[PDB]
Design an enzyme around this catalytic site. Structure first.
Site, PDB file in Angstrom:
ATOM      1  N   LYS A  65       0.846  -1.211   0.000  1.00  0.00           N
ATOM      2  CA  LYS A  65       0.000   0.000   0.000  1.00  0.00           C
ATOM      3  C   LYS A  65       0.876   1.254   0.000  1.00  0.00           C
ATOM      4  CE  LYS A  65      -4.044  -2.170   2.245  1.00  0.00           C
ATOM      5  NZ  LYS A  65      -3.653  -3.566   1.946  1.00  0.00           N
ATOM      6  N   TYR A 149     -10.197  -0.425   7.879  1.00  0.00           N
ATOM      7  CA  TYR A 149      -9.054  -0.878   7.052  1.00  0.00           C
ATOM      8  C   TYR A 149      -9.553  -1.797   5.936  1.00  0.00           C
ATOM      9  CZ  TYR A 149      -4.379  -2.740   6.029  1.00  0.00           C
ATOM     10  OH  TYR A 149      -3.198  -3.126   5.470  1.00  0.00           O
ATOM     11  N   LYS A 314       4.458   0.375   8.598  1.00  0.00           N
ATOM     12  CA  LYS A 314       3.396  -0.400   7.942  1.00  0.00           C
ATOM     13  C   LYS A 314       3.654  -1.888   8.157  1.00  0.00           C
ATOM     14  CE  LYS A 314      -0.468  -0.738   5.691  1.00  0.00           C
ATOM     15  NZ  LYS A 314      -0.802  -1.965   6.466  1.00  0.00           N
ATOM     16  N   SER A 317       0.744  -8.555   5.524  1.00  0.00           N
ATOM     17  CA  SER A 317       0.536  -9.999   5.694  1.00  0.00           C
ATOM     18  C   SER A 317      -0.073 -10.586   4.441  1.00  0.00           C
ATOM     19  CB  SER A 317      -0.322 -10.271   6.885  1.00  0.00           C
ATOM     20  OG  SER A 317       0.317  -9.832   8.053  1.00  0.00           O
TER      21      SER A 317
HETATM   22  B1  LIG Z   1      -2.491  -6.349   4.567  1.00  0.00           B
HETATM   23  O1  LIG Z   1      -1.404  -7.186   4.408  1.00  0.00           O
HETATM   24  O2  LIG Z   1      -2.658  -5.674   5.757  1.00  0.00           O
HETATM   25  C1  LIG Z   1      -3.824  -6.834   3.902  1.00  0.00           C
HETATM   26  N1  LIG Z   1      -4.230  -7.922   4.801  1.00  0.00           N
HETATM   27  C2  LIG Z   1      -4.974  -8.944   4.424  1.00  0.00           C
HETATM   28  O3  LIG Z   1      -5.498  -9.005   3.310  1.00  0.00           O
HETATM   29  C3  LIG Z   1      -5.151 -10.046   5.421  1.00  0.00           C
HETATM   30  N2  LIG Z   1      -5.395  -9.858   6.674  1.00  0.00           N
HETATM   31  O4  LIG Z   1      -5.757  -8.523   7.003  1.00  0.00           O
HETATM   32  C4  LIG Z   1      -5.460  -8.260   8.409  1.00  0.00           C
HETATM   33  C5  LIG Z   1      -6.201  -9.229   9.326  1.00  0.00           C
HETATM   34  C6  LIG Z   1      -5.899  -6.824   8.675  1.00  0.00           C
HETATM   35  C7  LIG Z   1      -3.932  -8.322   8.674  1.00  0.00           C
HETATM   36  O5  LIG Z   1      -3.536  -8.200   9.867  1.00  0.00           O
HETATM   37  O6  LIG Z   1      -3.193  -8.481   7.677  1.00  0.00           O
HETATM   38  C8  LIG Z   1      -4.870 -11.406   5.011  1.00  0.00           C
HETATM   39  C9  LIG Z   1      -4.752 -11.820   3.731  1.00  0.00           C
HETATM   40  S1  LIG Z   1      -4.445 -13.497   3.664  1.00  0.00           S
HETATM   41  C10 LIG Z   1      -4.437 -13.516   5.408  1.00  0.00           C
HETATM   42  N3  LIG Z   1      -4.233 -14.657   6.084  1.00  0.00           N
HETATM   43  N4  LIG Z   1      -4.678 -12.370   5.985  1.00  0.00           N
END
Ligand SMILES: *[B]([O])([O])[C][N]C(=O)/C(=N\OC([C])([C])C([O])=O)C1=[C]SC([N])=N1
Length: 360
Positions: A65, A149, A314, A317
């Site tokens: 992002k 978010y 940042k 995940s």
């Molecule tokens: B990013 O990496 O923050 C986008 N995140 C996601 O798409 C996923 N989880 O979002 C939360 C729970 C906010 C996080 O902490 O990352 C995601 C995609 S695949 C997975 N196991 N979690």
């Protein structure tokens, strides 16, 4: 002595967290008063014994992002969009939809009115399905009022920024953004020639996990990069003035805060905290409730420079990977931590806080 002390500091932060979270491989890169330092741990792939190095490619998930925000910063610098533009200005398919009343700033900062964390499972990576999803979407609450978010939110921000530049998002990143930032080991689509560097991700029972296709994946979470390249990006963020002027301005646009939630000030991509701040407060700002629940924003009367005595960070995940980046503008300090397990944000911040505290 200094190399021994820095190694002891980073090992003491990393080793117990890798053990406690069963992380197979982890790369650290540190920028300290204009010098890079790399610490590599464990295995990129358990099955073939490939070791992590500063050139190993990891999925960085939502750290992507900040790259999306940089492309939007370039479109802003070129006067091709403004943050106060209505989203539908940049995509005729959205004319007459609720995106006639939602700004690009709302999309970038997750305040469009309840766009969810993910696209629903009913929306595949398909241009028509994505188009129809946004055409029919209706806010749960007034645009500009609550932060939730969201991948579809900043995904659409990146998509529309690319439309303002008249080229596809992925092409602009590959052909313009990554080259302008000096990034040759940073990919949305890893070349065949680079696949040997792509770490395996690990989940439950060590299930292998590399990110699959999804709607607006490139904009939300699609970057694969090395610790060395991601530290080059942090160094660009620490010194935008070293880049050619339009790119300096693009990076500066990602260092402007629009509102606060708790201790966190929201920028484009980057999230900022006062520095120093307690570890528990930095963990709380990166907590599951901050990410998963709506929060009423406290809007700033004018955008705030995210510089000086602040930490910009940042998390990112994917199913198989867990990344974290943090830097302190006023101390010329930057940190990257890339792992091939999705391990708790609180644990990523624990590593980073120990290192940043000990560099201080
Ligand atoms: B990013 O990496 O923050 C986008 N995140 C996601 O798409 C996923 N989880 O979002 C939360 C729970 C906010 C996080 O902490 O990352 C995601 C995609 S695949 C997975 N196991 N979690």
């Amino acid at each position: 002595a200094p190399a021994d002390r820095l190694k002891a500091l980073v090992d003491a932060a990393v080793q117990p967290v890798m053990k406690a979270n069963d992380i197979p491989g982890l790369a650290v890169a540190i920028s300290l008063k204009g010098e890079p330092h790399y610490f590599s741990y464990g295995l990129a792939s358990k099955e073939d014994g490939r070791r992590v190095t500063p050139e190993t490619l990891f999925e960085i998930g939502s750290v992507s992002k900040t790259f999306t925000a940089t492309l939007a910063g370039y479109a802003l610098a070129q006067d091709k969009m403004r943050l106060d533009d209505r989203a539908s200005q940049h995509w005729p398919a959205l004319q007459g939809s609720r995106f006639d009343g939602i700004s690009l700033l709302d999309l970038a900062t997750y305040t469009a009115g309840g766009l969810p964390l993910q696209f629903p499972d009913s929306v595949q990576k398909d241009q028509a399905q994505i188009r129809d999803y946004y055409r029919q979407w209706q806010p749960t609450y007034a645009p500009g009022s609550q932060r939730l978010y969201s991948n579809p939110s900043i995904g659409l921000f990146g998509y529309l920024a690319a439309r303002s530049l008249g080229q596809p998002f992925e092409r602009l990143m590959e052909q313009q953004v990554f080259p302008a930032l000096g990034l040759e080991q940073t990919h949305l689509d890893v070349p065949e020639a680079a696949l040997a560097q792509y770490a395996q991700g690990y989940g439950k029972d060590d299930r292998p996990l590399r990110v699959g296709p999804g709607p607006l994946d490139a904009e939300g979470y699609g970057v694969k990069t090395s610790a060395a390249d991601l530290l080059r990006f942090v160094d660009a963020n620490l010194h935008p003035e070293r880049l050619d002027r339009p790119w300096a301005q693009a990076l500066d646009a990602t260092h402007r805060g629009y509102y606060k939630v708790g201790d966190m000030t929201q920028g484009l991509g980057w999230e900022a905290y006062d520095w120093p701040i307690s570890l528990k407060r930095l963990q709380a700002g990166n907590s599951t409730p901050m990410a998963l629940q709506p929060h009423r924003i406290a809007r700033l009367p004018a955008p705030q420079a995210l510089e000086g005595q602040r930490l910009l960070n940042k998390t990112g995940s994917t199913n198989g990977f867990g990344a974290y980046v943090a830097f302190v503008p006023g101390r010329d300090l930057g940190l990257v931590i890339l792992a091939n397990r999705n391990y708790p944000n609180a644990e990523r911040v624990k590593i980073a806080y120990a290192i940043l505290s000990g560099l201080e």
